[PDB]
Design a protein around this ligand. Structure first.
Ligand code: R02
Ligand code: R02
Ligand code: C8E
Ligand code: C8E
Lengths: 619, 619
């Protein structure tokens, strides 16, 4: 039955593999990436008419009937995302009259206008002079002076926020303005009667910070700020030191863009770092067949390769398959062997983790490291020495990264300060990197592949963490994947792997929860709205990936020979395309709960294959 | 008569011009460049068999009958240069037996062996483990803490020395050792009875520094050096900030190589600065027609283009010659507009100088700036706006650079501290950048082209400087060119240009001195020995360049219609080749008096053309 499904899925995956031996699906987000790029180009005075065109096609193509843009496909209109697209288009050439611009304008106005947008949006506009800098939360270069153990020092922030802060402190220090031509001025963004509904700091704003901001904005106005020249250089140097190999910073869009703007402010356009930073951009861009062009928020080569391998193995291919070896070798060359920012909390920990993108040595993450090390543990490579060695280095690094509560974060250890969540500036997504259930799960499943069971203290401290986090309905939150189906699947699968008993109550309470959300069509689906409204937990159109996740939770919990189980397998079998792949018009990936969503192009092919491979194992 | 000579010279130069519109002759030095490169490759574990080959042919080809190598062609054997070439060859494959190895070895031993070599040589060997680090003058990272105005702070050193110091402080801080394979160990460098004759600090060693060093080497042996981590990062950052656009550092061999070694020490081989730094090297290499390969100590594109233009103009071509325009435009795009290290002494001075090499924004020099601004002042470019503007910016930058004594230095203002000349480490070439007669001359000649005569206070302060520097026999030292003929020619030519009276006594006392050295063959020549032994001042085989220099001094001083004058013109007319150029088997360029000499490939063609162009003007 499914065998033909599985067989076609395999050969399909194998066809996507690149020559070098890795997999790499494009990462999907939203138009703010491309829109901000257009503005970045204006700032850097490097506008390519041809590119602007491909960018306009993409922007329009993404706009919906109502004239808005959302974070995820089929999501509510987003003000920020729409404002930035509006300005972007207007700059490229669209007149405020044209149908598309008209519809957008309405929605923006009906929302309170520009005054209701997140800090970033108002800041970008501030950069081109369409909004007063005085009204933008201030972040001073001086933050660079705070010591390792002090409130708000830059190591209290999550890796992704950190670099962005450092880069912006230089920008906000000089508060530069790169004027748009009259043709693109967007005053109309203010023309609204609706009361401005401003978003506040992620965790509530204490009058202290509010005060501190006003203070900083006044200090900004002074004629002489002592030790600021130093403060700036401290930031610039912090940047120059960490620049990624591909010319980016952290391998993510934000800091990268701001870092380039910072170097531009400092007349360093003829510096190696800026040049490399600029041309490195092209690697993230993507030519769309319909004439458009998009920019990836980040890239997932290592991640894709890691899961690809685990899926093809669980699916059947030999641990020494010559095609899976191309991958295994490639992964060994990726391992990071130098201290990253994580070392600030673990100076005696030996390097050995892996990153998400291609070349990002200073920021490996526990998730990639766990999946990559685990994947390697399922292969038989020519040089058994390097495989044995690589796994051990990574394995040890993972252990040494375990946080206090017994779970694992992504990039740091105990990055749990609650302090930064109240600053005015921080009103978008996560700003700290605390332990999460999904990462912790992947780690346990990784250790489980080696054997290490509930006997080892590390495993127990973690399982304790998971048990305490389990939700009332027996489900588990999904931090980096949408959502409860993603988390529950991860945990149950992991717990099964570390020896724990699948018969326990909490495991059953979970398994039941999964069967209880199986859509009519046999599959499972969870809409990104489940982060905003609990009524959507486990609800949503069925997707290949999410179906596969709920399916793994069941297979793992013993209910592989169930109705719900066989039903779900049927779904994947029927919905499969002729080439062997699957389709998935919805996002199943999470960047920041309720704020930033991602589309993992490979998920739709890899997880169904993995789930089917594990089902075939159950018989 | 000469018209045919000049006509041929012109078409020849015009044929050497590159497409972009600039001239660029290879810069010649000595085998330490290539020899050190071989070792650099060993350190960085990046050895290319094919390249080592081309390097061996070059090394051998340069060795002389006696089996030694010199700084300049036809110079005495040099111990340092010979020791490094010896080790280099041995590493590439030569056995200590072979003829070349045998002769070299002897000369080395008859000199006291490895213990008589300069610091650098013993350091390089120290780097590969063929010499104890303990015996190498120590330079600590901590030097990074000294403030702007303090003894031995890094801004008291000359630009070329500064970067080298910073880079090495990181190296010497870790004192790394990259072992050579047994096959290449060079113990035989010690096997000598001759007493080791060690070279001391450029200006004499006070027992203080001698003690201080011993102190540092002791402090080096301790188990904990507080704030050293910080000292290092201060150096690393200092470097990262200043890296040149081509990936070099200063556009010179030394710091560039050491900076790469430093980054290697700090596990930063995957960092952008290193990559760019490594691949930028190829631009300086040169394929030799006989199968060899040499590395340029530095490159002179701007410099060559600058003189090339001035010569072709003084020769006759129109100020709007479409070919000289390609050059004029090219030169405008080179002007530096950002603060360099010079700004540390002139914060309110607006950028506008030019550099020697292609892309080196942080280190413009008064010499290039003067010759380039002057050369532009002799052209008629399409955009008379940018020409007018550029000249102004450069002009002003020159003025603001003028030192205290009224003369100009190369890279800095009043870089005259006598302190650094006594440190143990500093036993090779110049370490400070004080004002010099030749640069000062070129500056005055520049201003002169505009008009600014002896009326202007600036000019006078300088002329006073020159008058006070003139030597007893009426000659002027040659800092960046060999030698008294170089300086005297410069000065007298300049003085003539700033209105001064050529009839004055000191001018005549100079003019006579010139005539008094005209070799029998009608030309002039000065051997590089004139820096070591005063018996050679104005003495040496005749060369096209030096002949043209003495010839300019005469033409400038009114004695254009003289015997010596017409005699010299004859020389150039005859010695000229059929293609139009000239030959010059001798070095007429100076890096560091008595320590480092250079061969300016274009000098032989450009100066004779310029001299003949100015002679044609005298009639
Ligand atoms: C499934 C695997 C999970 N791994 C992949 C992770 C790397 C992907 C998240 O990547 C991004 C990309 C862009 C942003 C921002 O826009 C942003 C917006 C605002 C600020 Br302030 C900063 C950045 C954010 C994150 C991680 C656990 C290891
Ligand atoms: C005629 C024009 C005059 N200009 C040409 C200048 C650029 C040429 C000198 O360039 C070099 C090249 C190599 C070295 C060292 O090897 C060195 C050895 C030991 C140490 Br310590 C440091 C460097 C040094 C200098 C200057 C006045 C503007
Ligand atoms: C530059 C001094 C070399 C000593 C520093 C190496 C050890 C520092 O521990 C790591 C601290 O966390 C920051 C890491 O990001 C690395 C880039 O900085 C460059 C290498 O020092
Ligand atoms: C990064 C703070 C901005 C202050 C820089 C203004 C320039 C101050 O003059 C310092 C002169 O030293 C030469 C430095 O240029 C090299 C790169 O440093 C980066 C920005 O100047």
């Amino acid at each position: 039955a499914y065998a033909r499904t599985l067989d076609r899925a395999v050969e399909y995956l194998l066809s996507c593999q690149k020559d070098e031996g890795y997999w790499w699906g494009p990462l999907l987000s939203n138009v703010t990436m491309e829109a901000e790029y257009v503005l970045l180009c204006h700032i850097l005075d490097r506008v390519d008419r041809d590119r602007m065109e491909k960018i306009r096609r993409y922007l329009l193509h993404e706009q919906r009937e109502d004239g808005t843009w959302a974070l995820y496909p089929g999501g509510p209109p987003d003000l920020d995302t729409t404002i930035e697209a509006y300005v972007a288009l207007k700059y490229i050439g669209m007149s405020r009259d044209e149908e598309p611009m008209q519809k957008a304008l309405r929605f923006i106005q009906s929302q309170g206008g520009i005054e209701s947008s997140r800090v970033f949006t108002r800041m970008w506009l501030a950069l081109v002079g369409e909004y007063p800098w005085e009204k933008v939360p201030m972040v001073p270069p001086e933050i660079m002076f705070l010591g390792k153990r002090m409130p708000l020092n830059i190591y209290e922030f999550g890796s992704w926020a950190r670099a962005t802060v450092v880069a912006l402190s230089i920008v906000m220090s000089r508060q530069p303005v790169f004027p748009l031509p009259e043709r693109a001025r967007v005053p109309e963004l203010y023309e609204t009667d609706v009361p401005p509904r401003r978003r506040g700091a992620k965790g509530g704003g204490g009058w202290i910070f509010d005060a501190l901001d006003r203070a900083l904005h006044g200090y900004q106005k002074l004629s002489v700020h002592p030790f600021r020249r130093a403060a700036e250089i401290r930031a610039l140097d912090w940047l120059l030191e960490r620049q990624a190999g591909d010319g980016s910073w952290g391998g993510i869009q934000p800091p990268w863009f701001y870092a380039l703007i910072a170097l531009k402010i400092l007349d360093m356009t003829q510096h190696p770092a800026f040049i490399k930073g600029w041309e490195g951009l092209e690697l993230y861009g993507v030519e769309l067949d319909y004439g458009g062009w998009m920019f990836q928020a980040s890239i997932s080569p290592v991640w894709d390769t890691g899961l690809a391998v685990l899926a093809l193995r669980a699916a059947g291919l030999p641990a020494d398959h010559d095609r899976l070896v191309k991958a295994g070798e490639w992964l060994l060359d990726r391992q990071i062997t130098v201290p990253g920012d994580w070392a600030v909390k673990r100076p005696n920990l030996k390097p050995g983790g892996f990153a998400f993108q291609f070349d990002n040595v200073y920021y490996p993450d526990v998730d990639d490291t766990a999946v990559v090390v685990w994947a390697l543990n399922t292969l038989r490579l020519p040089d058994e020495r390097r495989r044995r060695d690589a796994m051990t280095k990574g394995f040890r690094w993972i252990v040494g990264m375990q946080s206090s509560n017994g779970g694992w974060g992504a990039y740091d250890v105990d990055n749990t300060s609650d302090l930064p969540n109240h600053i005015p500036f921080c009103d978008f997504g996560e700003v700290t990197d605390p332990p999460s259930e999904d990462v912790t799960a992947h780690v346990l499943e990784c250790f489980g592949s080696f054997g290490y069971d509930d006997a080892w203290k590390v495993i127990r401290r973690a399982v304790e963490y998971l048990k305490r986090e389990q939700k009332p309905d027996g489900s588990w939150f999904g931090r980096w994947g949408v959502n409860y189906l993603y988390g529950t699947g991860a945990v149950v699968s992991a717990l099964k792997a570390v020896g724990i008993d699948t018969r326990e109550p909490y495991i059953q309470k979970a398994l039941d929860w999964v069967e209880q959300h199986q859509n009519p069509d046999g599959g499972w689906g969870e809409d990104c709205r489940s982060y905003e409204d609990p009524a959507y937990a486990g609800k949503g159109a069925s997707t290949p990936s999410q179906t596969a996740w709920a399916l793994m939770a069941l297979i793992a919990g013993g209910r592989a020979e169930s109705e719900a189980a066989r039903r779900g397998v049927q779904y994947l079998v029927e919905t499969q395309r002729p080439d062997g792949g699957w389709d998935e018009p919805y996002y199943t990936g999470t960047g920041f709960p309720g704020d930033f969503y991602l589309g993992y192009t490979m998920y739709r092919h890899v997880f169904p294959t993995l789930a089917l491979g594990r089902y075939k194992q159950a018989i």
